Symmetry: C2
Subunit: 312 residues, 2 copies
């Protein structure tokens, strides 16, 4: 299988590429692409690690050589924080980058599975889908918003609270990937219960966890290493499914049946063609039902913004 | 076991901390230190990964809180004559903090130029009265993993199964891959000269391909993680853990010299023979001695 990382020179992209060079199955190929001129040197640095994963890097404006033959494209390009740029400015920069890179995908490797890491995922996945539909190549089973950082953060905070081994906790997290749209289903964690205060407190922590890192970095950066790790979990899961492994399940933000919104994160069985089955969210507690209903207005507006970005 | 990374905010340090957060044994502790103000948040970013390694990060001038109870300290801190002096002074400072807070730790020096910075570390520890030659290592593992990669590619081998001993020092002609000792593979004279040149210049290869954006960081993080995980395995009592590293040994060639080491509960358990060298390797070893000895002297003079 061949994986392309678009945005490979950034902090997320370098962490993701290091993890993929060391954990992709033997005989995989990895390409790195970013406008930054350092990118071929990022790939040469990684090529010195003795795993059976061939790696090459590419720069300039044209991602084609990285995309040729790609089975999975992970798009982590964009900016989290830049001097002088406020939320709207960052959104327009990231939206523009996603629109450009997904158009390159649609041209070169339109049958690849695509994982959008670039934030804000609630909107950038809708931009990606609109670009793909315009190209006439959209497959709703092959476009994912990578929401895995919310899952691994939830696993960490629940294992700390509940006195569990961190690698043994798995929290389902549904909805979207920002603020009140992130819905950790603490009611479905087996073996334990939470008080209403613990649910409110953990949900708030999970929904604001990105700030927690910005703050400790004295405003000097944002979550990059954990995002790299989260993206590698999702990329390696998709690779295993694409190679034929069965029973691989991950939550991700995908276009679904529209019960709640056009795009929605829910547990997915993955298979050889991307999503194999969109699994039910299961039973919700009263707090979860209310938080779900409460955020749908916001999530639907996020989605609409991506649609309107691509045309206007 | 507790591992401290000093220089954690840098490219090497962040890559190394990511690998250690995910690969240290359950129940381990990892502390990150760097004067960069970002450091405490580099640890918070990593603390969101759900593995049973507790992580904390520290900034400011005092590495004490990171070094308390540390069993292994990996020093990747740094950043032509002014560049050397800055990096030398950073190693001299950090090794002095190690000598004060965790003098019984195993110390891996990653900061370049290793051939010289290990000598600076040794003289600092000697001046503090806590120098243990079994516990101070120059981390040369990047040369080993590069040699493995390049041999595996040339000879069509599984790269994870190839293990090339590399001896000498960690820069240019002082890097000596013992290609003659790789089981199940044979090399022409041309291949030996070409592989040796590529290994010796691999650091430049990366710098060149990075076009201004710096040197090897991600593969150096992997190399240092391999070496630090081997030290932890040995400290915990695992048998048969062998790694090449630059250490103060018998002085047959130079005061410090990288050779295969059996690791154990107290750092080096045994310094192993370099074994039989081919004629090409013997002439490469003889040819590097004056350079290596000058590198060592530069570090000694820097402290003394």
């Amino acid at each position: 299988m061949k994986v392309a990382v678009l945005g490979a020179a950034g902090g997320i992209g370098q962490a993701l590429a290091l993890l993929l060079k060391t954990q992709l199955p033997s005989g995989s190929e990895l390409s790195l692409y970013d406008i930054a001129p350092v990118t071929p040197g990022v790939a040469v640095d990684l090529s010195h690690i003795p795993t059976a994963v061939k790696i090459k890097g590419f720069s300039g404006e044209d991602a084609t050589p990285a995309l040729e033959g790609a089975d999975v494209v992970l798009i982590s390009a964009g900016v989290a924080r830049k001097p002088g740029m406020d939320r709207s400015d960052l959104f327009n920069v990231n939206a523009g980058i996603v629109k450009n890179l997904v158009q390159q995908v649609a041209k070169t490797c339109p049958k690849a599975c695509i994982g959008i890491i670039t934030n804000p995922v609630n909107t950038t996945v809708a931009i990606a889908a609109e670009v793909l539909k315009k190209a006439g190549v959209y497959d709703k089973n092959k476009l994912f918003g990578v929401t895995t950082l919310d899952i691994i953060r939830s696993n960490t905070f629940v294992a700390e609270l509940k006195g569990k081994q961190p690698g043994e906790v798995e929290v389902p997290v549904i909805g979207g990937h920002s603020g009140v749209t992130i819905l950790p289903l603490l009611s479905q964690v087996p073996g334990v219960s939470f008080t209403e205060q613990e649910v409110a407190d953990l949900t708030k922590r999970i929904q604001n966890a990105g700030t927690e890192v910005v703050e400790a970095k004295a405003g000097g950066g944002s979550a990059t290493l954990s995002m790299g790790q989260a993206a590698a979990r999702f990329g390696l899961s998709l690779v295993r499914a694409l190679q034929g492994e069965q029973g691989v399940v991950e939550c991700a933000y995908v276009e679904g049946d529209g019960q709640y919104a056009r795009f929605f994160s829910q547990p997915l069985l993955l298979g050889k063609n991307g999503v194999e089955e969109r699994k039910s969210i299961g039973t919700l507690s009263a707090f979860e039902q209310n938080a779900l209903e409460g955020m749908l207005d916001t999530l639907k507006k996020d989605i609409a913004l991506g649609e309107e970005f691509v045309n206007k």
